[PDB]
Amino acid sequence: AEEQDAAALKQLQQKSYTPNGRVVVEGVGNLMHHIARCCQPIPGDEIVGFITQGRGISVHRADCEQLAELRSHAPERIVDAVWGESYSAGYSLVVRVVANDRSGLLRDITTILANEKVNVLGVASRSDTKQQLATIDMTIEIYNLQVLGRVLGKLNQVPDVIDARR
Amino acid sequence: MLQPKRTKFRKMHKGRNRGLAQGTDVSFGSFGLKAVGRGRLTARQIEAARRAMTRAVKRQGKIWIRVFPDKPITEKPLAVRMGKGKGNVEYWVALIQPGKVLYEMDGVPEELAREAFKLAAAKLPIKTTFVTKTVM
Amino acid sequence: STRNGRDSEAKRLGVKRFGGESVLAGSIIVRQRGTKFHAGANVGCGRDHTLFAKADGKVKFEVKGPKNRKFISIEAE
Amino acid sequence: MKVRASVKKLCRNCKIVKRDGVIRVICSAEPKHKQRQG
RNA sequence: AAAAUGUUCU
RNA sequence: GCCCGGAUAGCUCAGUUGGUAGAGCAGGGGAUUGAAAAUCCCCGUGUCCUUGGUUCGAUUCCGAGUCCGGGCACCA
RNA sequence: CGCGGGGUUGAGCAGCCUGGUAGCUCGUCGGGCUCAUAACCCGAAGAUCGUCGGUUCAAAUCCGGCCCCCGCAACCA
RNA sequence: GCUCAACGGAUAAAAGGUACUCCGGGGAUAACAGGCUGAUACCGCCCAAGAGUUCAUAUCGACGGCGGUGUUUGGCACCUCGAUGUCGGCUCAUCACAUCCUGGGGCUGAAGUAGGUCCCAAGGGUAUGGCUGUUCGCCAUUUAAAGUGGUACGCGAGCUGGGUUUAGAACGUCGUGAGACAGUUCGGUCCCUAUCUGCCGUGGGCGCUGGAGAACUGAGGGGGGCUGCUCCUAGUACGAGA
RNA sequence: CCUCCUAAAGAGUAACGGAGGAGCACGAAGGUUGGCUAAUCCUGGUCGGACAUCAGGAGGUUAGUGCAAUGGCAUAAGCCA
RNA sequence: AAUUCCUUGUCGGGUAAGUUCCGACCUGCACGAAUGGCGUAAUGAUGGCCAGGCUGUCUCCACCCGAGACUCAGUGAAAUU
RNA sequence: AGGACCGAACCGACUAAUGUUGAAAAAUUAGCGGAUGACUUGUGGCUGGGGGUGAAAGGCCAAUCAAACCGGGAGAUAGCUGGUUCUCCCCGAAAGCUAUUUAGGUAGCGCCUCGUGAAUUCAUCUCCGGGGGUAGAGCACUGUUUCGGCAAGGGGGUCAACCCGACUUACCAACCCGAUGCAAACUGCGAAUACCGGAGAAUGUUAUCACGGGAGACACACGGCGGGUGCUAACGUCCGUCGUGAAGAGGGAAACAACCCAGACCGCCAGCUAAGGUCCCAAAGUCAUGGUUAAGUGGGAAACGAUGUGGGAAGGCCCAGACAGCCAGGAUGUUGGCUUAGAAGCAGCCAUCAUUUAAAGAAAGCGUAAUAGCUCACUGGUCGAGUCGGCCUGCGCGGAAGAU
Ligand SMILES: [Mg+2]
Ligand SMILES: [Mg+2]
Ligand SMILES: [Mg+2]
Ligand SMILES: [Mg+2]
Ligand SMILES: [Mg+2]
Ligand SMILES: [Mg+2]
Ligand SMILES: [Mg+2]
Ligand SMILES: [Mg+2]
Ligand SMILES: [Mg+2]
Ligand SMILES: [Mg+2]
Ligand SMILES: [Mg+2]
Ligand SMILES: [Mg+2]
Ligand SMILES: [Mg+2]
Ligand SMILES: [Mg+2]
Ligand SMILES: [Mg+2]
Ligand SMILES: [Mg+2]
Ligand SMILES: [Mg+2]
Ligand SMILES: [Mg+2]
Ligand SMILES: [Mg+2]
Ligand SMILES: [Mg+2]
Ligand SMILES: [Mg+2]
Ligand SMILES: [Mg+2]
Ligand SMILES: [Mg+2]
Ligand SMILES: [Mg+2]
Ligand SMILES: [Mg+2]
Numbered sequence A: 001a002e003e004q005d006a007a008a009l010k011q012l013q014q015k016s017y018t019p020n021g022r023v024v025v026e027g028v029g030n031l032m033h034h035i036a037r038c039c040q041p042i043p044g045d046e047i048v049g050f051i052t053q054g055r056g057i058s059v060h061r062a063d064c065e066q067l068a069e070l071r072s073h074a075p076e077r078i079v080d081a082v083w084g085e086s087y088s089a090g091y092s093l094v095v096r097v098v099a100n101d102r103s104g105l106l107r108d109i110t111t112i113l114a115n116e117k118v119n120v121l122g123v124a125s126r127s128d129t130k131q132q133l134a135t136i137d138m139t140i141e142i143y144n145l146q147v148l149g150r151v152l153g154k155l156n157q158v159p160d161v162i163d164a165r166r
Numbered sequence B: 001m002l003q004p005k006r007t008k009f010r011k012m013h014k015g016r017n018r019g020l021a022q023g024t025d026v027s028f029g030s031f032g033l034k035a036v037g038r039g040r041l042t043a044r045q046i047e048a049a050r051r052a053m054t055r056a057v058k059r060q061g062k063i064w065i066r067v068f069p070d071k072p073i074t075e076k077p078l079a080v081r082m083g084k085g086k087g088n089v090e091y092w093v094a095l096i097q098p099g100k101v102l103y104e105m106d107g108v109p110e111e112l113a114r115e116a117f118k119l120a121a122a123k124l125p126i127k128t129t130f131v132t133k134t135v136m
Numbered sequence C: 001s002t003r004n005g006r007d008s009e010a011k012r013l014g015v016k017r018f019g020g021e022s023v024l025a026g027s028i029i030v031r032q033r034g035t036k037f038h039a040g041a042n043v044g045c046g047r048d049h050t051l052f053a054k055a056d057g058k059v060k061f062e063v064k065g066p067k068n069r070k071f072i073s074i075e076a077e
Numbered sequence D: 001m002k003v004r005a006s007v008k009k010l011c012r013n014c015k016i017v018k019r020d021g022v023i024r025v026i027c028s029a030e031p032k033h034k035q036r037q038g
Numbered sequence E: 001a002a003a004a005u006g007u008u009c010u
Numbered sequence F: 001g002c003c004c005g006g007a008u009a010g011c012u013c014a015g016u017u018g019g020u021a022g023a024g025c026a027g028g029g030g031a032u033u034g035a036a037a038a039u040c041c042c043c044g045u046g047u048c049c050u051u052g053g054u055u056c057g058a059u060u061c062c063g064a065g066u067c068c069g070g071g072c073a074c075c076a
Numbered sequence G: 001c002g003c004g005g006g007g008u009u010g011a012g013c014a015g016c017c018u019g020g021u022a023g024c025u026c027g028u029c030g031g032g033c034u035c036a037u038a039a040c041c042c043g044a045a046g047a048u049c050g051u052c053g054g055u056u057c058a059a060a061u062c063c064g065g066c067c068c069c070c071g072c073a074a075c076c077a
Numbered sequence H: 001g002c003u004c005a006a007c008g009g010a011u012a013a014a015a016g017g018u019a020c021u022c023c024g025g026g027g028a029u030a031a032c033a034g035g036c037u038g039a040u041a042c043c044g045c046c047c048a049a050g051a052g053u054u055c056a057u058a059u060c061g062a063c064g065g066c067g068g069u070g071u072u073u074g075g076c077a078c079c080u081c082g083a084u085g086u087c088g089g090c091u092c093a094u095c096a097c098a099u100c101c102u103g104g105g106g107c108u109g110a111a112g113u114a115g116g117u118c119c120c121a122a123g124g125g126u127a128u129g130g131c132u133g134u135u136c137g138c139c140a141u142u143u144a145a146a147g148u149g150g151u152a153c154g155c156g157a158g159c160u161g162g163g164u165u166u167a168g169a170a171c172g173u174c175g176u177g178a179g180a181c182a183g184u185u186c187g188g189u190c191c192c193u194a195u196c197u198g199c200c201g202u203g204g205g206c207g208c209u210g211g212a213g214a215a216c217u218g219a220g221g222g223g224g225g226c227u228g229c230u231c232c233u234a235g236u237a238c239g240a241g242a
Numbered sequence I: 001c002c003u004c005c006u007a008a009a010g011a012g013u014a015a016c017g018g019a020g021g022a023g024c025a026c027g028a029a030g031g032u033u034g035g036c037u038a039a040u041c042c043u044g045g046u047c048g049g050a051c052a053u054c055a056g057g058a059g060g061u062u063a064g065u066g067c068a069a070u071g072g073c074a075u076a077a078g079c080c081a
Numbered sequence J: 001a002a003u004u005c006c007u008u009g010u011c012g013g014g015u016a017a018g019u020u021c022c023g024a025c026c027u028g029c030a031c032g033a034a035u036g037g038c039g040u041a042a043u044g045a046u047g048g049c050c051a052g053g054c055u056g057u058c059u060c061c062a063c064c065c066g067a068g069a070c071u072c073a074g075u076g077a078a079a080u081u
Numbered sequence K: 001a002g003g004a005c006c007g008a009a010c011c012g013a014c015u016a017a018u019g020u021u022g023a024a025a026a027a028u029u030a031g032c033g034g035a036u037g038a039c040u041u042g043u044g045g046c047u048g049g050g051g052g053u054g055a056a057a058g059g060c061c062a063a064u065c066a067a068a069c070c071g072g073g074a075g076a077u078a079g080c081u082g083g084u085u086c087u088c089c090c091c092g093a094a095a096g097c098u099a100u101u102u103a104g105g106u107a108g109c110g111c112c113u114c115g116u117g118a119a120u121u122c123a124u125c126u127c128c129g130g131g132g133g134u135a136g137a138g139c140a141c142u143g144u145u146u147c148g149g150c151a152a153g154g155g156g157g158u159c160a161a162c163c164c165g166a167c168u169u170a171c172c173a174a175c176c177c178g179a180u181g182c183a184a185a186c187u188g189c190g191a192a193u194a195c196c197g198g199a200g201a202a203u204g205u206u207a208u209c210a211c212g213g214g215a216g217a218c219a220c221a222c223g224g225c226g227g228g229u230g231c232u233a234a235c236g237u238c239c240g241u242c243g244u245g246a247a248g249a250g251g252g253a254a255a256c257a258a259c260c261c262a263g264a265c266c267g268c269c270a271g272c273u274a275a276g277g278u279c280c281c282a283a284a285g286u287c288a289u290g291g292u293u294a295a296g297u298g299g300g301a302a303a304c305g306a307u308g309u310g311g312g313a314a315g316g317c318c319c320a321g322a323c324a325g326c327c328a329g330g331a332u333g334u335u336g337g338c339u340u341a342g343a344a345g346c347a348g349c350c351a352u353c354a355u356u357u358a359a360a361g362a363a364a365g366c367g368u369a370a371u372a373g374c375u376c377a378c379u380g381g382u383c384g385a386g387u388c389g390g391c392c393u394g395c396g397c398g399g400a401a402g403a404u
């Protein structure tokens, strides 16, 4: 019960929280852009931007499926690039965390997510009926790949978590 | 817990549990937990067994639950006399004869599977033996 | 407190005269709800599908037709 | 002394033995592990 | 016939 | 004499054999008034008692001295 | 868990009353009156009718179950 | 022409109370206790997910499983309605062990002291009060400990009769009302001279082979079996100290 | 009072066993003669939509029976005249 | 509360400790104004509680004196079976 | 003065004890209340039974009171309880159904009996004619059920956001296909039995049916098999069918209506057998042959536990030396990398190779802050016979604590 309460509190906190050097596309900075949710690049192994009709460019992360499809369809809108100067904030990590649902696992996970210097923008949550598998996607904001890795490691360390990835 | 989502009838007769099973072979998986002992597996028990075996395997390889608790077992509350109609459905059971494969399992080593089924067996009220996917 | 105390009086359906049973004309061979038995030769199907003898003789059950239905005939002997 | 219905070799150094018709795990390596059937 | 009230300190 | 406990934003308290600290109030700063209350917004705004040690890294663990709160012993 | 009654717009009540028409008062919102808030005036929005099944042509309505409520009787030794 | 629907239709035409009750019955049927049962209860054990820094198993023990006991709440209605007296207290107890203390021991997350848990062990012991009818409980202060059960929830031909459970009266409540309430309140007859068993005592008769008086033996039976504190060992072992 | 099951393959068969219905309706919803064949699904097509009506194919009684259920029903007992 | 189930309500008093008593709260299951309400001196073989005194009520029984009980003599029942 | 005070007589009756077959059908003793009053008491009177009287309790009205007593109606009525008296012989039930202001009563039918009549009537079995839709089975149907397939239809997201609609995606996902179960109220199947009809044989005292007289009974019980209910609890409960008891003794089951065996006309100091037994109590094997247990199992119990012990076919290592002890090694690239704070076989993650090799895992457990260290697998000797571990079943062990 206590665990549940804690989890609830964490969720509430998250909700409350929720409430241009970044990407230099092809040797010309300050281009209207945005990270795509299909797969969200931070310091990723190269990126590629699809020049959209509206809302400028959509950055996809290099070797993406959607990006590949786009290329196949029409290569001329696509532009390869560098990940600029590393934007001060450098937001956008969605972290999918699969875990075995006992009475007080989700709460624990939430707790572990907190304390670490991570801005929790959103928390999607559900228990899968295929077993009793708690699965959760935390939309979080953080400043580096190393930091992300560390966070992942921390998450793993809570033994009830089966696997944690993007 | 395993339970029929919908039914024709809420209350079922006791019946009897004589005979052997039809679900006798390890149809789907590689290994099987075959009920030697006659009885009735409640839904809860089955669930427990599943938990034990899944846990044991560590979600490596697939597991089947051949028996389904489709029969509603009623009870009367305490300080209630014998008349006044048939009692309410407290839980659901699967009548297990000798032969019924209860769980099948693949995607694991044999030893591991056996271990899992030991744990599973502990949970269950009926005597159970390990079996394999026989050719024909 | 139940709400299932009810049941009807049993109507005594079924076969009154069986295979090779000698019947007088008028004798009910079968009582039934449907034409679970159909009227064969020298057998009448009453308004409640009661099969009765239209002649004196031995009762004779027989599956007939494409639908494979039980016809009760009477073999005039 | 544990005294169980079920006595088991809890390690490799645990040794089952019947004394006065009583199954007993006795272990050199760990005296916690020593058991009895009762 | 019916028409209540006016945040504090300047 | 000896021990044990406690010493964290202004101030109430939260977090401990180790991962850069929060909740309330209070405060700020804006809109706005003469300034306020109200209303509307936005915000940690900290010598974790000082000094050393241990460590790949200390609020926390070991000292070392302080301070307070105990609980013990002591009869010139 | 035995007998009835109820769960409807933010609140309270009607409707159910024998399926097919969502109404009344207060509140809310937008105007107006005023110096300004009241009161008053005008206009407006609002409801998967506890939930889940079911019966149906169709359910708020009929029926079942479950969730919460309100009565209630729970005794004689 | 009858929701004569209690539907083989008692009349055209009919509801309650009784603790003021009465008669005839019933253990065909309840309350009491016994019996059978064991859902529940309590006590065990099986699995071991975890917790326990590490480590399932010192201690815990999820999800589940299997038993025992008869021991709570119940089920059944077999015993008793030509009476088997009910709760509690008192007085005497007696057995069981599932031991609370005392004795022995294993493991310990056992340094010592103190504990925890498990095994064995029933010899003896095993609280006075306050409140309440209470058992129980809570509280006070003890105690080595304040065991848990059985015994007609032991024991009313032993006592009590505070409670429940007649007749009076009242309150609250429901009932139009008589009245009614595991609601309350005040008041309210507890009989028996022991035949038999049993038991505690205590004699007579005969026997034990001739008798009598003594003294014995001891088959067997009973009783008894509790424990504190203080001091020494030694402020020694142990412990960084306490 | 009726339907099923309980009911142990004739009938029958209890329980304060488990399920639902009836206390009618219809002068056509009866009689007969002639004819017709369903639910659903796909593709298409005025408003027309997941759902009205019309094309054809698949479908083959899944439907219908004035109402409960069971047994029946294409020779239709179903639906038209 | 002669009323209050939940309930030994909570708080205070009284006690070493108070399900009773007194006082107070008000959340009156379900008080209430002539089937009267709330007060009330006096009264009561009235109910409840406390205190002093007093005590074999008790700790925890002891002895003693008488009437029975026991033995003898006389008379001589009873329920029950 | 006073329904004033205290307190005798007098009236009363609060407490206690006694007594309860009493001294007494309400008293005694000790106390206790009133004791000039609505007091008390004598004598006589009046009030009468649904009537009186009642400072009200249903109190009192002659030891009697929610309707006095006595007599009569009157032998009220009693579906209830009890009881119902000599003998022998034959037959011999029921505790069911249906209805019942009925449920413990009663009525008709079923069964019992006595009587008369009647057919090859009935029963047994054998061959034929049948209908079943239960057991079982099955899953096309009704539902339900797990998995795999391809997948409309939703959801997410990427193109685009007015859309067309395109792409896809470890999201869900109906229909359809393949495999899997389950069902009292499912059946594209389907027994045994039972039931009905026929023919035939022997048997059987007509055993069958009809009518008529007389009933009884309509509380059943346990045992078996099939179920419902309950908890696949009850000597529970309600049904079906047979048995027994009821109404049935004898023998066995220690004792034990209903279990087993077996139907007592009488008698016998004859014999044979049934169940069950055969060392002694206690009638008969201390019988025979081959095995098993060792627990007093037998002579009470489960999950689970365990080199308990027997039997079976089959398998791996085995005098190219096993298994177990005993003696050594158990290395190099190497700190594999990576990921971490560190990780050097051993927080973990990922490759998991080769080399020198007799053999040595990028390491199975312990161990460190990590190294180190200590065992292991694997290896060679040492040693000289089998050993290892399933799975089969037999019997056993623990699990296994209660009260005289
Ligand atoms: Mg020994
Ligand atoms: Mg009487
Ligand atoms: Mg009797
Ligand atoms: Mg009883
Ligand atoms: Mg008992
Ligand atoms: Mg009992
Ligand atoms: Mg009885
Ligand atoms: Mg009975
Ligand atoms: Mg009698
Ligand atoms: Mg008697
Ligand atoms: Mg013991
Ligand atoms: Mg003793
Ligand atoms: Mg001794
Ligand atoms: Mg006490
Ligand atoms: Mg008693
Ligand atoms: Mg008593
Ligand atoms: Mg007695
Ligand atoms: Mg009393
Ligand atoms: Mg009274
Ligand atoms: Mg007495
Ligand atoms: Mg002795
Ligand atoms: Mg039948
Ligand atoms: Mg049958
Ligand atoms: Mg269309
Ligand atoms: Mg009240």
Ligand SMILES: [Mg+2]
Binding pocket: J007
């Ligand atoms: Mg009270």
Ligand SMILES: [Mg+2]
Binding pocket: none
């Ligand atoms: Mg006192």
Ligand SMILES: [Mg+2]
Binding pocket: none
């Ligand atoms: Mg108090």
Ligand SMILES: [Mg+2]
Binding pocket: none
């Ligand atoms: Mg007192």
Ligand SMILES: [Mg+2]
Binding pocket: none
């Ligand atoms: Mg008071």
Ligand SMILES: [Mg+2]
Binding pocket: none
């Ligand atoms: Mg009043």
Ligand SMILES: [Mg+2]
Binding pocket: none
């Ligand atoms: Mg008034």
Ligand SMILES: [Mg+2]
Binding pocket: none
């Ligand atoms: Mg009044």
Ligand SMILES: [Mg+2]
Binding pocket: none
């Ligand atoms: Mg008054």
Ligand SMILES: [Mg+2]
Binding pocket: J044
């Ligand atoms: Mg007076």
Ligand SMILES: [Mg+2]
Binding pocket: none
């Ligand atoms: Mg004398």
Ligand SMILES: [Mg+2]
Binding pocket: K004
């Ligand atoms: Mg006076």
Ligand SMILES: [Mg+2]
Binding pocket: none
């Ligand atoms: Mg007088």
Ligand SMILES: [Mg+2]
Binding pocket: none
């Ligand atoms: Mg008087």
Ligand SMILES: [Mg+2]
Binding pocket: none
């Ligand atoms: Mg008295």
Ligand SMILES: [Mg+2]
Binding pocket: none
């Ligand atoms: Mg006198």
